[PDB]
């Protein structure tokens, strides 16, 4: 169906990120993030029955973990930290990430927590399992320049590769 | 052990043969030299920089830093990375 | 420790140790370029280097010459030594206005 297809598409781009860590534990995450600068994040499978993926991110207090929720074909941050209306929904978990990452990059959010209750997620640079493809490292670089890839002096085959992963992280 | 790679404006690059085999299209073709007649020098130098960045950081033991790509050569080097399959 | 460089002449990619001597570099160019170290001269920036010093004693760090951004070095090969001439690479074209 529309759900089933969009679901598998979500994991397929998750495999393209290079910062997906699959079956990882919290203690393995806490270790791999103990030395990273504040804001470094990774995505891994969740050890809870009702959750698939989970964000592990470093803060000045140390590594912490946030779960990602799936309900009727929509990804969103765990609904137990805030009212659902303040937690934006998404199709791809990567689009979820790219949104919360780009917000901090735009200085619309900072490393300090707001006092008015809204969701606070400080994300800077990802933590890669392996060096990505040079091709993918431009797809990222190009996407940080423009979102109108079909108006570029490129062969059509190259643009279709860009259209598979449109995010900036 | 070493391989020499030639660009369009003739710039010669010598890298470790292991560094060059990350590119899939080069691996199939292996004199110990290869001329790339479409890829200019400013693009050819960065692909070799990616080769080292790939070999050193294949393991996640060291924190993988970001690969800096200036937007001007991004268009060109994407076409080159598709040529070399890396 | 590791310090990644680019020997460029009229370009060689390699890595080295921060404790390696500058003479140890002239031995690596002898392997591929097939020229003796006595017929070799190095020139970081515009300055020659003593073969007894190390790369760190000449101003090379793992933070300055990472593999993704390797600090480059120059070489000048009859009677007298040649002059150090390195040709820059091509100029990247103008940015398409959409990406500007
Ligand atoms: C960033 C952020 C955080 C929160 C609240 N977060 C928690 O209180 C989580 C709860 C959790 C624990 C495991 C987990 O992993 P998993 O169950 O496998 O998905 C997922 C979530 N506690 C911890 O982090 C404590 C911890 C730290 C290091 C470790 F090594 C082990 C445990 C709210 C808003 C916000 F912006």
Author numbering:
A (entry chain A): 30 to 198
B (entry chain C): 17 to 46, 57 to 112
C (entry chain B): 1 to 10, 13 to 79, 82 to 104
Provide text from the study:
The Src homology 2 (SH2) domain recognizes phosphotyrosine (pY) post translational modifications in partner proteins to trigger downstream signaling. Here, we use structure-based design to target the SH2 domain of the E3 ligase suppressor of cytokine signaling 2 (SOCS2). SOCS2 can tightly bind to adaptor subunits ElonginB/C and scaffold subunit Cullin 5 and RING domain protein Rbx2, to function as substrate receptor of Cullin 5 RING E3 ligase complex CRL5SOCS2.
With the structure of 9 in hand, further optimization attempts focused towards engaging an attractive hydrophobic groove identified between His149 and Thr93 (named "HT" channel). It was hypothesized that this channel could be readily accessible by further modifications of the 4-fluorobenzylamino group, particularly meta-substitutions. We therefore next synthesized compounds 11, 12, 13, 14 by introducing methyl, ethyl or allyl group at position 3 of the benzylamine to form favorable hydrophobic interactions with the HT channel. To reveal the ligand binding modes, we solved crystal structures of SBC2 soaked with 11, 12 and 13.
